[PDB]
Amino acid sequence: FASVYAWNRKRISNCVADYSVLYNSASFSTFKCYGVSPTKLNDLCFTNV
Amino acid sequence: SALGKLQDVVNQNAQALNTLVKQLSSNFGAISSVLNDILSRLDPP
């Protein structure tokens, strides 16, 4: 994991994104979405990640 | 083979209906202008 002033960016594309293996996973300390609701992410489609 | 006093009424009314139609695409300070894109990616609260 890089540091805060040289953070690393990975672009995600060309795949189904299952946040179901992430949202029903109780292993993170903060999961804060802005502009979306973390329970409706499997009904949308996105251009990039 | 003149009628501008009648064409003025037609034009003013069409010009008002066009503005009413076109105001349906302003956000008024929301995230989207279309209601279904607020309903689809947001929850009731």
Q: Which two tokens stand for residue B28?
A: 């008024």
Residues on chain A touching B41 (C-beta within 8 angstroms): 35-37, 40, 44
Return the HEC string of chain B.
CCCHHHHHHHHHHHHHHHHHHHHHHCCCCCCCCCCHHHHCCCCCC
Determination technique for this entry:
cryo-EM
Say yes or no: A44 contacts chain B, CB-CB below 8 A: yes
What resolution in angstroms, rounded to 1 decimal? Answer: 2.7
d(CA B42, CA B45): 8
Residue of B nearest to A45 (CA): B41
